[PDB]
């Protein structure tokens, strides 16, 4: 069967402590619509109860120790999460855990440290003389004590920070110490983009490397994870991420599928990451997200023949995870760049019914976003589900592309003899509607095909040669399959 990933959270999921129970209760539904793997949000204790998990405090607290005034994380307790994972697994759905390793937040106390300021546009340049600051670098885990791991963190396990408690000023501070320097290789944006926020972990320190590997193995075994999603990958030493993945694979004996979030709209820099990690993990196709967004915002003016230009999926199809929107690009967020609603079904048709890439459905698109703007994403589950059924049951076999018009483009799938009644013909348009003659295979000659989306009510008959004339409404999508 075709695999399909689901990101199971949005930025505004409520802080009610019931997200793991929600996942548990949705397992049958997700397995029925064709989801084969779920990516869950960071499951460890953040700097406060309401943090989404991207300001992690203790990676070994999955919601069972009293720290930061709460036992549970925003999402629920550890046993609720283990029950949700058991429910997905008994329905043959895999679970990928979010991995947040670039920084630590919420230290228990400050320490005195010698530091220098660096230029924010070129972090290789020191712009001050050294002086003393008070940084939030002492991590002692008072509610956990030594359970699972007796490692304690100090200033010398980090490369820098962004706050001095002494003078109350925010700058990019590089710490002075034995062999201290920003890590390499990382993105060369801003000269060296090792530093992002909070306390930056030093992946040049050998005890840090060894402890983080040990934690990885622990995490995968404690939750029976099947894979990982790597946060902020362009800010972490590449050869460490390559080796960390390999050590978890070695120790568990599992495939451990892994996809890294390398956020940059540039195929060439994404290819460099693949090469530097030996092709041992996939990346999200950031350039394809931007092309889909562009088409959605030009009111019919985009040249649809160019949708695949500059994307990772056209170059390295087996190492790309395709997506429409996520918690970074939804309304009101940092990297806001939402695909407009009218084009969203066309974009899901594009990523779910084509043969290359591993596609991700976003929770925020299925169920709606609960942010406070006036342009939240509405619940589109009734428009997306017919497209998921087309992926599950009909998108198999040889593909033929028709990227030959500036508005109306399409593709077909001939079907596979081992998947009964498989085969489809898809058309999308960013402008007025119309028709296109396309080939679906001579083995489907004489059949009645119909639009599974319901956008068009008239069926189409495949001629004796295996060709059919398919239609599509203005600014819409049609997917024809065997009636
Ligand atoms: Ca370093
Ligand atoms: Ca870093
Ligand atoms: Ca157009
Ligand atoms: Ca057929
Ligand atoms: Na670092």
Curated annotation (Swiss-Prot):
Catalytic activity: Endohydrolysis of (1->4)-alpha-D-glucosidic linkages in polysaccharides containing three or more (1->4)-alpha-linked D-glucose units
Names of the cofactor(s): Ca(2+); Na(+)
MF GO annotations: alpha-amylase activity; calcium ion binding
Active-site residues, record numbering mapped to chain: 231 (nucleophile), 261 (proton donor)
Coiled coil: none
Cofactor binding: number and manner: Binds 3 Ca(2+) ions per subunit. Binds 1 sodium ion per subunit.
GO biological process, one term: carbohydrate metabolic process
Residue numbers binding Ca(2+) 1: 102, 194, 200, 235
GO CC terms, sorted: extracellular region
Enzyme Commission designation: 3.2.1.1
Keyword DNA-binding: no
Predominant location category: secreted
Keywords, ordered alphabetically: Calcium, Carbohydrate metabolism, Glycosidase, Hydrolase, Metal-binding, Secreted, Signal
Binding locations of Ca(2+) 2: 159, 181, 183, 202, 204
Positions that bind Ca(2+) 3: 300
Family under the similarity heading: Belongs to the glycosyl hydrolase 13 family.
Description of how the protein assembles with itself and partners: Monomer.
Official protein name in the record: Alpha-amylase
Species of provenance: Bacillus amyloliquefaciens
Part of the full-length chain shown: 32 to 331 of 514
């Amino acid at each position: 069967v075709n695999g399909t990933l689901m990101q199971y959270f949005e930025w505004y999921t409520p802080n009610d402590g019931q997200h793991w129970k929600r996942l548990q209760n949705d397992a049958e539904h997700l397995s029925d619509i064709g989801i084969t793997a779920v990516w869950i949000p960071p499951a460890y204790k953040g700097l406060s109860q309401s943090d989404n998990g991207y300001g992690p405090y203790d990676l070994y607290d999955l919601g069972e120790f009293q720290q930061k005034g709460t036992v549970r994380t925003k999402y629920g307790t550890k046993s609720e999460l283990q029950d949700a994972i058991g429910s997905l697994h008994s329905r043959n759905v895999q679970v990928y855990g979010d991995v947040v390793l670039n920084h630590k937040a919420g230290a228990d106390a400050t320490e005195d440290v010698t530091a220098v300021e660096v230029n924010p546009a070129n972090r290789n340049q020191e712009t001050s003389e050294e002086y003393q600051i008070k940084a939030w670098t002492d991590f002692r885990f008072p509610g956990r004590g030594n359970t699972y791991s007796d490692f304690k963190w100090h200033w010398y396990h980090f490369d820098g920070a962004d706050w001095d408690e002494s003078r109350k000023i925010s700058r990019i501070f590089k710490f002075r110490g034995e062999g201290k320097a920003w890590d390499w290789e990382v993105s060369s944006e801003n000269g060296n983009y090792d530093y992002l926020m909070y306390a930056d972990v030093d992946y040049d320190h050998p005890d840090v490397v060894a402890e983080t590997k040990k934690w990885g193995i622990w995490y995968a075994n404690e939750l029976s994870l099947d894979g990982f999603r790597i946060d902020a990958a362009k800010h972490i030493k590449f050869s460490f991420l390559r080796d960390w993945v390999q050590a978890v694979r070695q120790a568990t004996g599992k495939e451990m599928f892994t996809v890294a979030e390398y956020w940059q709209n540039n195929a060439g820099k994404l290819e460099n990451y693949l090469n530097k990690t030996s092709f041992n993990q996939s990346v999200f196709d950031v350039p394809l997200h931007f092309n889909l967004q562009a088409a959605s915002s030009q009111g019919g003016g985009y040249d649809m023949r160019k949708l695949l230009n500059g994307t990772v999926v056209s170059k390295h199809p087996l190492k790309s995870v395709t997506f429409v929107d996520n918690h970074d690009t939804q309304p009101g967020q940092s990297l806001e760049s939402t695909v407009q609603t009218w084009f969203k079904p066309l974009a899901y048709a594009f990523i779910l019914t084509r043969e290359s890439g591993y596609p991700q459905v976003f929770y925020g698109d299925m169920y709606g976003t609960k942010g406070d703007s006036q342009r939240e994403i509405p619940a589109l589950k009734h428009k997306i589900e017919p497209i998921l059924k087309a992926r599950k049951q009909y998108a198999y076999g040889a593909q033929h592309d028709y990227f030959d018009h500036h508005d109306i483009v399409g593709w077909t799938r001939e079907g596979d003899s081992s998947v009964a009644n498989s085969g489809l013909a898809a058309l999308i348009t960013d402008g007025p509607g119309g028709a296109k003659r396309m080939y679906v295979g001579r083995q489907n000659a004489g059949e009645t095909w119909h639009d599974i989306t319901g956008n068009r009510s008239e069926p189409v008959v495949i001629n004796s040669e295996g060709w059919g004339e398919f239609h599509v409404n203005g600014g819409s999508v049609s997917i024809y399959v065997q009636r």
